[PDB]
Amino acid sequence: LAEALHGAL
């Protein structure tokens, strides 16, 4: 999730 959210934002 950390990865996903960081990339998304």
Side-chain angles (χ1 to χ4, degrees):
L1 179 70
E3 177 88 359
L5 288 173
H6 183 97
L9 274 294

